[PDB]
Design a protein around this ligand. Structure first.
Ligand SMILES: CN1[C@@H]2CC[C@H]1C[C@@H](OC(=O)[C@H](CO)c1ccccc1)C2
Ligand SMILES: O=C(O)CCC(=O)C(=O)O
Ligand SMILES: [Fe+2]
Ligand SMILES: [Sr+2]
Ligand SMILES: [Sr+2]
Length: 325
């Protein structure tokens, strides 16, 4: 279908090499070693994996199971999450009730269905707006949401120590939105022409990604793409464009994409943590000086969000209007 054909320059080459230099960070090393290894990965790559991360492996497996079970539901059930008979778009206002979403660039569509909902804070109103089926989705994903948030806040405090910010710097308005995106990539008859997910930064602060199958790729120097090895019991940590700005580019944001597969489907679980739409984003004043002048002026997260979700002329189109010095 023409609707899914990516522009020639954005098409993935067939043989992308494994990223052997993707850091795999054991969180059960000594505290300072973990801080140093995370700091180095954040400065150099903006993407790393965490293992022995304290989130139950059984819960990771049960969550991947119920997410796969959701995408196996019949059309009559999935229609209940399609407002006015079609998938929702990633556009503001981005509601926290569960919806199925379509995504692309303005023009082609990504070879992807995404279930998305808010996860924080957990109350009856929010969980009652989640999928009704499968029966155990709400029970399992409520537990998963809380555990992934706990691990994310641990990683943000490692990041604080690495940067020389006070512990809890991000335990406020900067992390108040937790969007869980369950991504379904069905088999594609022509992977040479399509993308599961176009190249992007995550616009938010930090993302934890759970995957068990290949398809995730990262952009490194000289327009080189590498493959991010799936470790089913690990989380991939992607630093967002918001953290790039707050660290005044001391940290890299992760530019990543997902390629399609001709033979098998793939489910990934992305937990996108970041600011409320009411937030003002700027480089952390604590880190600035005459030697480290701010590279961004303060901006509205809502204003950024509208650009980020619409303009894909460049990976950092969202923050281009706010660049200074
Ligand atoms: C693959 N796409 C990318 C990343 C996830 C998915 C959907 C969209 O990202 C979002 O909708 C997030 C939700 O927090 C967002 C929204 C406004 C500002 C900052 C971040 C773009
Ligand atoms: O499916 C994946 O591995 C990546 C998902 C993603 O990048 C996203 O949802 O933002
Ligand atoms: Fe992403
Ligand atoms: Sr429909
Ligand atoms: Sr309901």
């Amino acid at each position: 279908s023409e609707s899914f054909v990516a522009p020639l320059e954005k098409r993935a080459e067939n043989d992308v090499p494994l990223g052997n230099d993707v850091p795999i960070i054991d969180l059960q090393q000594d505290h300072l070693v973990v801080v140093q290894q995370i700091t180095k990965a954040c400065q150099d790559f903006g993407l790393f994996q965490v293992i022995n991360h304290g989130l139950p492996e059984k819960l990771m497996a049960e969550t991947m199971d119920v997410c796969k079970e959701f995408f196996a539901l019949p059309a009559e059930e999935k229609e209940k999450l399609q407002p006015k008979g079609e998938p929702a778009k990633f556009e503001l206002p981005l509601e926290q009730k569960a919806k199925l979403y379509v995504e692309g660039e303005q023009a082609f569509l990504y070879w992807k269905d995404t279930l998305a909902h808010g996860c924080h804070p957990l109350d009856e109103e929010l969980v009652n707006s989640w999928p009704e089926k499968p029966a155990t989705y709400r029970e399992v994903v409520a537990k998963y949401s809380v555990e992934v948030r706990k691990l994310t806040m641990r990683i943000l405090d490692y990041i604080c120590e690495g940067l020389g910010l006070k512990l809890g710097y991000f335990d406020n308005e900067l992390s108040q939105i937790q969007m869980m995106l369950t991504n379904y990539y069905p088999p594609c008859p022509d992977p040479s022409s399509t993308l599961g997910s176009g190249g992007h930064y995550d616009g938010n602060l930090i993302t934890l990604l759970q995957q068990n199958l290949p398809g995730l790729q990262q952009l490194i120097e000289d327009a080189k793409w590498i493959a991010v090895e799936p470790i089913p019991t690990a989380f991939v940590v992607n630093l967002g464009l918001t953290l790039k700005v707050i660290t005044n580019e001391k940290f890299e944001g992760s530019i990543h994409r997902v390629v399609t597969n001709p033979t098998r489907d793939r489910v990934s679980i992305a937990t996108l943590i970041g600011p409320d739409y009411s937030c003002t984003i700027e480089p952390a004043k604590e880190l600035l000086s005459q030697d480290n002048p701010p590279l961004y002026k303060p901006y509205s997260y809502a204003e950024f969000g509208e650009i980020y979700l619409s303009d894909k002329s460049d990976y950092d189109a969202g923050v281009k209007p706010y660049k200074i010095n």
